[PDB]
Design a protein around this nucleic acid. Structure first.
Ligand SMILES: [Mg+2]
Lengths: 64, 209, 113, 332, 274, 41
RNA sequence: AUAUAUUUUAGUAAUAGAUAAAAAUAUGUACAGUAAAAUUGUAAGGAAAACAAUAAUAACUUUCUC
């Protein structure tokens, strides 16, 4: 009943030849509720994302 | 001695600070390095192998020059794997609306308003008052910080927050603004010109960058 | 061989693995390498300087605070006591946001409450 | 722009190859195809220039008693790319004056650092494992490298790795030392001594061993760049015990030959010392005692070890020694 | 093998000896992990960490100010107690475990310029429990984690056995990721600007959630994970999502300080009274 | 097993050669379970 | 833009660290490191799944700085 992916013989990573994980990322533009844009490095392929529900419109983060 | 309750009301910067040139260059270099060393973009996961979006994505991209037996490749033979030349850096092109950022220079445009908060956005500002001229001095039943807060609240009608009851310096309180003889706002460098040297020396370490 | 779900899982796994995705490690000419090293050193030095600056500033501030406390206790004892009152539950404004990359539509708020 | 100037600053602080310098300032990989293939990282130029400017400024700022001054100089220089290039990518052993001057303090410092990184450690390990130190001379604190060579016999060229086995052929004639000093010491007035001792020759009376002094030089003058102790330099007045080769007796273990280097005690000119060349017993020899007598401070050491072989008899004959004893194979 | 008897022979020098350097076996390993020559190289300061900048400029000074009590000296916590020498049996006896607890506790140092509270590290552990049955779930969880963060997670295996729940040792279940430096800052920003706000009924972190030596923790349900950018952009791709715990380690000596620090970074602690 | 009645013999371990005593290469000096004594010079 | 030929990729599968108390290798050597409990916490999660945190820096070296 245990559903698994039965492993292959893994690859031997020699000592000294281990290369660190540098995942492919993009410099994404994040637009908040208001006009404030903020840059973040993200792994998903998209240049721009505007947001509807954010901290800037939520009453908990701002009593104005 | 008489107890004069100082206040250095500060405006906290609202955007990431403007970099140095050298720093910027370094950052660019680092980015380039990262790009060179980055893994391949695994398009096969994000985009499906018979989708319209996927097709569109493909259309933007240009492939790598593969190898064919009989030709000279004087820049090394193309070591291509998973749709990328391993040799070199690899890049990827990309209501619905293009996100255009707001300009980081309204103060510059103004070129005048020293009594304005929307001035140097990426710099820490400090309130300063005229009489030499200096920080809002205010002259014993109440706690000190609270008293200071009360005193300045009356002059406008603004919204501040005291960081703590603990004072600094000669008794000066710190506080942070959140709402809107001279009401003057300045950066840490600008203040040096607008004030006596001795005074500056006394309170130089307070005024942050 | 494998169910569609299994295939999907495999794909997901791959997305994380370094299998076939990682490029060849960058080599460098000796001179280039040297240059890089120099740059790195410079950067490190700069960072250290910055740290010192900030640290120094902090120290100065602390000293100032101490001085104030000393003065205050001598002068107005009640006031000093009040100042001391421990801020065990103090909590930052919340309206006092974190600096963004680019500024908002309304570059500051005037009215409140 | 202090690193561009070369008035007071020695000429060694620059890269002597012009092309390389040019490349650095705005390559070396010889082959044309390879060069074509090569692709450097982006934005290296401007950033590099900026870095250089920064470091140059720092150096200038730094620039202004002797040891302190030397230290300051070293601090000022180290970050110079040119100097780094010179040190890293040119040979430190058989040094070449203009490329790397050990007269120059920065280079010396770098050399010391390099030594600390590996060779020194290796030497220490060899000393400890083979029981060179506690057996002959209580301890040492590295100070200076000492590389030996046996050029005359055979004719080949090789720096001996510490704790090696040398054939009797190889160690038939005397060795050459290179005592690479560091640590801002005087050069005119400072003299050195060198002693090749072997502590494990069979004492039959006690049943233990006794230590023989097989080669002894005293009052040698050294220089930071010029430190090869060849028969050119020392003269016959400086030899207290002339070279005797390793001639291990059969089944007398592996005899450890451990070369010690000491610096003289310092009092106007070069201070010498007599050492009663005749009186000093070389066949059985107390190193510690000797040191105590003349107040030496052992700076550096090296070591090798010899075993019996067919060749040793011939060597003995050549040197005009006895035929050599033979011992039972059992450690009874 | 004859011996079976560990006994290091003492040396006759103060030279340290890093054996690895005398061996030529792993020539790539000889260089540092940040030296360009090493295959283990990766760039560190790719860009500027905005959150860190904020902390440095604005927050650190504030923290220094607020925490400052007047002449507060160390209130060194409960330690192992030495034995009173009123009897000969005490002589070679091990000390008494701390009056309060079994474990020994650290000294609380006063908050000066040298040791201001700061963010040290953020650990995320997503122990998908349904992975006892299906092992692919674990993989999916790990992928999700990776997507969220941008740095390789590590598998979480079931360390214990228990019959009541279907749990057996040696079973991959969930993923754990250690976030540090700029990456961690980025993650925190994402949490604060986007996720925590968007979550429907969130009243903020609980004030009782203090580790007590300046560590804070909180959960996220399986629903809230959809609100992350890397998942929200493709809901088609993520059918199952897995809840997670988030632990935040700080340079704070005490929990209250840590929570104050966190508040500076826009963390609502309206969950309770301390 | 109403009665027990099983046991092994004593192992005769201990010091077999005492301070001051002249050994010869090979002579056993101490027998022991574990190292209550460690090998010296 | 589109057609033909020839090749190149896609078989997507983990650890990326001399890994360090989940499983799997029980004999050699070489190099390295520390366990457990208890307590305080955290989506489902509790008596009992996972993760985090929990002893002192006197002296020393290098680096940056008044
Ligand atoms: Mg028995």
């Amino acid at each position: 009943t245990r559903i698994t992916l039965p492993r292959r013989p893994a690859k031997k990573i020699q000592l000294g030849k281990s290369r660190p994980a540098i995942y492919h990322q993009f410099n994404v533009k994040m637009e908040l509720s208001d006009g404030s844009v903020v840059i973040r490095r993200s792994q998903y392929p998209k240049g721009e994302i505007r947001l509807i529900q954010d901290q800037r419109n939520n009453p908990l983060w701002n009593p104005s | 001695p008489k107890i004069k309750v100082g206040v250095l009301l500060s405006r906290i910067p609202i955007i990431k600070s403007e970099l140095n040139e050298l720093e910027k260059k370094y950052y660019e270099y680092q980015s380039e390095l990262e790009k060179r060393l980055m893994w391949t973009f695994p398009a096969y996961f994000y985009f499906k192998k018979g989708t319209v979006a996927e097709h569109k994505f493909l259309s933007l991209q240009k492939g790598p020059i593969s190898k064919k037996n009989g030709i000279w490749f004087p820049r090394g033979i193309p070591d291509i794997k998973h749709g990328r030349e391993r040799s070199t850096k690899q890049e990827v092109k990309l209501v619905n609306r293009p996100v255009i950022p707001n300009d980081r220079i309204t103060e510059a445009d103004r070129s005048n308003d020293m009594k304005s908060l929307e001035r140097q956005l990426s710099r820490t500002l400090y309130l300063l008052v005229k009489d030499t001229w200096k920080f809002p001095n205010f002259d014993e039943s109440k706690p000190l910080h609270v008293h200071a807060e009360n005193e300045l609240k009356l002059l406008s009608g603004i919204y501040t927050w005291s960081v703590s009851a603990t004072p600094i310096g000669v008794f000066i309180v710190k506080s942070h603004i959140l709402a809107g003889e001279d009401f003057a706002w300045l950066t840490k460098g600008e203040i040096s010109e607008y004030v006596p040297k001795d005074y500056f020396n006394k309170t130089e370490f307070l005024l942050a960058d | 061989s494998l169910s569609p779900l299994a295939q999907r899982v495999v794909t997901q796994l791959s997305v994380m693995s370094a299998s076939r995705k990682q490029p060849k490690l960058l080599k460098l000419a000796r001179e280039d390498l040297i240059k890089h090293q120099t740059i790195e050193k410079c950067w490190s030095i700069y960072q250290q300087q910055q740290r010192e600056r900030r640290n120094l500033q902090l120290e100065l501030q602390y000293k100032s605070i101490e001085r104030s406390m000393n003065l205050l206790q001598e002068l107005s004892p009640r006031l000093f006591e009040a100042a001391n009152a421990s801020e065990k539950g103090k909590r930052f404004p919340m309206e006092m946001k974190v600096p963004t990359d680019f500024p908002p539509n309304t570059l500051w708020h005037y009215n409140f409450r | 722009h202090i690193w561009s100037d070369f008035t007071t600053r020695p000429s060694s602080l620059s890269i002597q190859s012009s092309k390389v310098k040019n490349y650095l300032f705005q390559p070396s990989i010889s082959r044309r195809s390879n060069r074509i293939k090569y692709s450097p990282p982006e934005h290296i130029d401007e950033i590099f220039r900026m870095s250089y400017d920064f470091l140059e400024q720092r150096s200038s700022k730094f620039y202004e008693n002797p040891l302190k001054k030397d230290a300051l100089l070293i601090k000022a220089e180290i970050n110079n790319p040119e100097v780094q290039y010179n040190f890293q990518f040119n040979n430190k052993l058989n040094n070449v004056k203009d490329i790397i001057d050990y007269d120059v303090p920065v280079y010396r410092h770098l050399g010391k650092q390099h030594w600390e990184s590996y060779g020194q450690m290796l030497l220490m390990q060899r000393l400890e494992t083979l029981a060179a130190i506690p057996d002959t001379l209580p301890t040492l604190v590295p100070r200076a490298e000492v590389n030996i060579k046996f050029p005359f016999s055979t004719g080949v060229n090789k720096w001996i790795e510490p704790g090696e086995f040398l054939s009797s052929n190889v160690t038939s004639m005397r060795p050459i030392f290179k005592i690479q000093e560091y640590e801002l010491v005087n050069v005119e007035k400072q003299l050195y001594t060198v002693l090749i001792v072997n502590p494990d020759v069979p004492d039959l009376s006690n049943d233990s061993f006794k230590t023989a002094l097989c080669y002894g030089l005293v009052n040698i003058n050294l220089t930071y760049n010029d430190n090869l102790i060849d028969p050119r330099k020392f003269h016959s007045s400086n030899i207290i015990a002339d070279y005797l080769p390793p001639v291990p007796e059969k089944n007398a273990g592996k005899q450890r030959f451990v070369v010690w280097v000491f610096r003289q005690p310092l009092i106007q000119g070069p201070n010498m010392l007599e050492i009663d060349r005749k009186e000093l017993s070389r066949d059985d020899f107390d190193i510690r005692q000797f040191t105590k007598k003349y107040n030496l401070t052992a700076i550096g050491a090296h070591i090798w070890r010899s075993e019996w072989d067919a060749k040793v008899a011939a060597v003995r004959e050549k040197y005009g020694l006895p035929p050599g004893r033979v011992f039972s194979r059992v450690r009874r | 093998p004859k011996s079976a008897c560990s006994l290091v022979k003492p040396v006759h020098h103060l030279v340290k000896i890093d054996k690895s350097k005398l061996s030529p076996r792993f020539p790539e390993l000889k260089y540092d992990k940040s030296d360009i020559r090493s295959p283990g190289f990766k760039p560190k300061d790719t860009h500027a960490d905005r959150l860190n900048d904020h902390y440095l400029n604005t927050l650190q000074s504030d923290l220094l100010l607020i925490n400052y009590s007047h002449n507060a000296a160390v209130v060194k916590g409960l330690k192992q107690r030495a034995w009173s020498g009123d009897s000969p049996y005490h002589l070679n006896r091990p000390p008494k475990n701390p009056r309060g607890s079994k474990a020994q506790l650290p000294d609380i140092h006063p908050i000066k310029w040298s040791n201001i509270p700061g963010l040290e590290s953020v650990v995320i552990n997503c122990f998908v429990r349904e992975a006892r049955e299906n092992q692919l779930l674990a993989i999916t969880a790990a992928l999700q984690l990776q997507q969220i963060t941008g740095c390789k997670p590590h598998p979480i295996f079931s360390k214990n056995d228990v019959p009541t729940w279907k749990l057996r040792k040696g079973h991959q279940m969930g993923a754990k990721v250690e976030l540090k430096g700029k990456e961690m800052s980025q993650f925190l920003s994402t949490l604060t600007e986007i996720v925590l706000p968007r979550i429907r009924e969130y009243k903020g972190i609980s004030n009782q959630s203090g580790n007590r030596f300046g560590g804070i923790s909180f959960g996220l349900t399986a629903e809230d994970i959809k609100f992350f950018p890397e998942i929200d952009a493709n809901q088609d791709s993520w059918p199952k999502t897995f809840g997670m715990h988030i632990n935040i380690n700080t340079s704070a000596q005490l929990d209250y300080q840590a929570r104050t620090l966190l508040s500076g970074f826009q963390f609502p602690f309206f969950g309770e009274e301390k | 097993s109403r009665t027990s009645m099983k046991d092994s013999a004593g192992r005769r371990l201990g010091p077999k050669k005492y301070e001051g005593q002249d050994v010869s290469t090979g002579e056993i000096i101490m027998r022991q379970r574990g190292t209550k004594f460690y090998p010296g010079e």
